[PDB]
Amino acid sequence: KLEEAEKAADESERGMKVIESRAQKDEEKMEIQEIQLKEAKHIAEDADRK
Amino acid sequence: KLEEAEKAADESERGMKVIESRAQKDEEKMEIQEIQLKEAKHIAEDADRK
């Protein structure tokens, strides 16, 4: 049961590492896409201002 | 150790679910900011075009 509970922790932790690494990749990509959106929008606003 | 391993199962699994929720929020924000980046770039393209 300790192996099952610890394995549930270890496997859910690996699950977590993959989806936390995914959250990190999605977070970095969303920040990049958000900064690029802010800039593409700021370019659009700058182009609208122009 | 089993109680702590079950608490770790809960924390690594709750972690995995909080991270899955965060990864989903960051994935949706990634997907929302890339779709809206493509739109913000098309607005920049339209803003530059107009």
Author numbering:
A (entry chain Q), B (entry chain P): 112 to 161
Please, what does the article write about this entry?
At this resolution, both myosin heads bind to the actin filament in a structurally identical manner with close interactions formed between actin subunits and myosin as well as tropomyosin. Interestingly, the kink in the upper head is in the opposite direction compared to the one in the lower head, bringing the RLCs of the two heads in close proximity. Notably, the arrangement of the ELC/RLC of the lower head in our model resembles that in the “blocked” head of the off-state myosin while the upper head ELC/RLC is similar to the “free” head.
Sarcomeres are force-generating and load-bearing devices of muscles. The basis of the mechanism of skeletal muscle action is the cyclical interaction of actin and myosin, converting chemical into kinetic energy, which leads to relative movement between thin and thick filaments and is the primary driver of force generation within the sarcomere. Combining cryo-FIB, cryo-ET, and sub-volume averaging, we present the three-dimensional structure of a mouse psoas sarcomere in the rigor state with a comprehensive description of the organization and interaction of key sarcomeric proteins in molecular detail.
